[PDB]
Amino acid sequence: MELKNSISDYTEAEFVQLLKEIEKENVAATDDVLDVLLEHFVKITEHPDGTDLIYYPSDNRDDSPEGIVKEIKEWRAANGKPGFKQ
Amino acid sequence: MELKNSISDYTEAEFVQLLKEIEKENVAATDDVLDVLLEHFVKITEHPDGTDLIYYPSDNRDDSPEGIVKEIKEWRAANGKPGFKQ
């Protein structure tokens, strides 16, 4: 599994791959890896809504991997924090 | 990555996890792993439509992981072949 130190080390596609890994662990028999992926996701995005970005997408936004990416990108830009790698 | 010998060794959820792995490789920089997952998917499902089950879902069916699972389950049952493990 890929786990990078911060949002800026990920390209959008690589971040989408972390989100697919999380999608895969949602149907895992156990939660061991899922909790690790979810803890990591929260630590690195630093988004106020945490895992809600995944389970409770806003009604005005695309409930999809790229949709989460967009959400993060915008929040970080509005706050003057480094975004995704190019 | 999990790769089992046949459809009957997979539970529906484990098969859904193979499908998520394939979803992840679609955004991979390279196709090396993707072609392996896709070759495997075709060999074990033995479904006439091959990878079209993924890229070109029928209009009358749910374009989702469980949707593919249902499709496979039905085709195998109509042909008297062993299905998923319980």
Curated annotation (Swiss-Prot), chains A, B:
Under the heading Pfam families, the entry gives:
Colicin_Pyocin
Entry keyword Iron:
no
Q: Which UniProt keywords apply?
A: Bacteriocin immunity, Plasmid
Top-level taxonomic group: Bacteria
Q: Which InterPro entries match?
A: Colicin_E_sf, Colicin_pyocin
Query: What Gene Ontology molecular-function terms does this entry list?
Result: toxic substance binding
Please indicate if the UniProt record lists Iron as a keyword.
no
GO biological process per UniProt:
bacteriocin immunity
User: What task does this protein carry out?
Assistant: This protein is able to protect a cell, which harbors the plasmid ColE7 encoding colicin E7, against colicin E7, it binds specifically to the DNase-type colicin and inhibits its bactericidal activity. Dimeric ImmE7 may possess a RNase activity that cleaves its own mRNA at a specific site and thus autoregulates translational expression of the downstream ceiE7 gene as well as degradation of the upstream ceaE7 mRNA.
Family affiliation: Belongs to the colicins ColE2/ColE8/ColE9 and pyocins S1/S2 family.
* Descriptive protein name: Colicin-E7 immunity protein
Task: Tell me which species this is from.
Answer: Escherichia coli
